[PDB]
Write a protein that binds this ligand. Structure first.
Ligand SMILES: N=NCC(=O)CC[C@H](N)C(=O)O
Ligand SMILES: N=NCC(=O)CC[C@H](N)C(=O)O
Lengths: 306, 303
């Protein structure tokens, strides 16, 4: 047997590989998002991860570089952008931070209220604001997956219902169609695990960009964002994540998870941003194999903030 | 002026902040619905902070005895986990802020009471009190007066208890469960005892004064998660966002909080706070203001 593999010599990169390959098959127990027809095309068995450190060290494994739409992960960015624009007190008069009346920014109703209060006299201006914030974080203007956007646009009855409800009850500060457009467009913003790992790292460092060496989000906005990820980030599994993983985290229906670990007293003692992708989702709406990866890392590396 | 005071540090800070925040107790009231509770001096405010080396700082009415009320929910939850194991507990109770309910709310807490080991209320409470002794180092005093005034007027809890019995979530009889739940609530504490239980949770169930593991670590983490997510009634999200420490309130005005190892208190700490005037959400008004102050000044957020 002239050709073989090498028998060898602790190591997070090696562990991430072994774990992605072990958790990959479990995708057969979940589904790709159905209520958006464009997301039903995607291959289910995909699993990728990126962990990023403040010194620039990046480790990754699996499908870490495949593009996907941010979906609900964008609720965190629009929420941040709205606080930066309008200030925390104004945003919190219109949106609840608890897991008519205001709604939580991590659910569709509060996220629509948020899009509507972005600054700008049109959907285009609101979006340029949101992209300028996105660009200070990831260093580039985000790409809209227009296929995904248009198929969301034609079938968005539930979101139109809510938006009209919010306008009735005077919790939309903009027109319904204008609001839908902004909201559906942030959802269709593209990224890889790498981009979300970076936003995660920045939040882990209280809005400080450790690559650019700038304060890019105010500290109190970053805190507020993480509190919402910990309490409301994993839909109706947020309590379970807090108890069994213990790391602030945000999922989307395309299969992204953005997670983070703040500086704490090996590995990743300076903190880290985490980007996971696994398009097969569970009954709660969270990436199935991605959730399993994150729980394993958190338990194995003792990442819990508790 | 032959006689005077002195011209001019967490201890000094805590004294100044208690004097500052005490007057704000005029914007709330003590609990009405428990008649024996709506009778306490509304203007009280006290605090104890406990470090794992033994060091203790206290200001105000830190040594005034009060009933634990909902703080007891964390103990019985922990006690049920230690007895039955986590998997058994989480089949009957939800960790989300017939269906199971959350253990931090009345309905979940009644279920937990009903699963404590023992075939009567006395045996269930005996395991509970003995767990409590391993934490604070004494068996706890029960406020029999608070208990029997709550027991006479406990319609809502009986309604809930019979609802849980109907839907199959009570592993005991209704009157038995109600007795256990109402007595756990009337267990008595000072800011010091709850500071100690908070210190122990901050160390993952390790008693840093005694040097032994008293709560298993996974149980201890689960208790902390539940406090951060559900511990402050319908203000838990606000506390997470602007305070950032796992905390649990009680309607008698107690708050137990804790800071994990992460200056000051780099080794972590337990916090016991008392402030009988409560707000609309059911949390200590001035105790909550104190806690938010300390957390912001000393950057305690675990975020
Ligand atoms: N995580 N979320 C996406 C949404 O909530 C948008 C709904 C979807 N675009 C639809 O309206 O079909
Ligand atoms: N913090 N408390 C919750 C309670 O349910 C207290 C019980 C109350 N004494 C009652 O009247 O049933």
């Amino acid at each position: 047997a002239m050709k073989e593999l090498i028998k060898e010599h602790i190591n997070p990169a090696l562990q991430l590989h072994d774990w992605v390959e072990y958790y990959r098959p479990f995708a057969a127990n979940g589904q790709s998002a159905n209520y958006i027809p464009a997301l039903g095309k995607v291959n289910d068995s995909q699993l990728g991860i990126c962990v990023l450190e403040p010194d620039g060290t990046m480790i990754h494994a699996g499908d870490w570089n495949v593009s996907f739409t941010m979906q609900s992960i964008s609720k965190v960015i629009s929420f941040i952008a709205a606080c930066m624009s309008r200030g925390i007190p104004y945003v919190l008069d219109r949106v609840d931070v608890e897991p008519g009346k205001p709604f939580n920014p991590m659910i569709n109703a509060g996220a629509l209220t948020i899009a509507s209060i972005l600054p700008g006299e049109s959907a285009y201006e609101k979006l340029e604001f949101l992209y300028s914030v996105m660009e200070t974080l990831i260093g580039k203007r985000p790409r809209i997956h227009e296929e995904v956007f248009r198929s969301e646009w034609e079938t968005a009855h539930r979101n139109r219902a809510l938006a009209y409800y919010l306008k009735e009850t005077n919790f939309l500060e903009a027109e319904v169609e204008e609001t839908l457009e902004v909201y559906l467009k942030q959802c269709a913003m593209e990224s890889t695990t790498e981009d979300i790992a970076l936003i995660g790292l920045i939040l882990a460092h209280d809005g400080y960009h450790p690559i650019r060496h700038e304060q890019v989000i105010p500290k109190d906005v970053a805190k507020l964002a993480k509190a919402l990820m910990l309490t409301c980030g994993m839909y109706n599994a947020s309590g379970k994540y807090a108890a069994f993983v213990g790391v602030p985290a945000k999922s989307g229906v395309s299969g992204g998870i953005m997670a983070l670990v703040p500086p704490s007293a090996q590995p990743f003692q300076s903190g880290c941003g985490i980007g996971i992708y696994g398009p097969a989702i569970d009954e709660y709406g969270n990436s199935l194999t991605g959730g399993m990866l994150l729980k394993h890392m958190a338990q194995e590396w003792e990442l819990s903030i508790f």
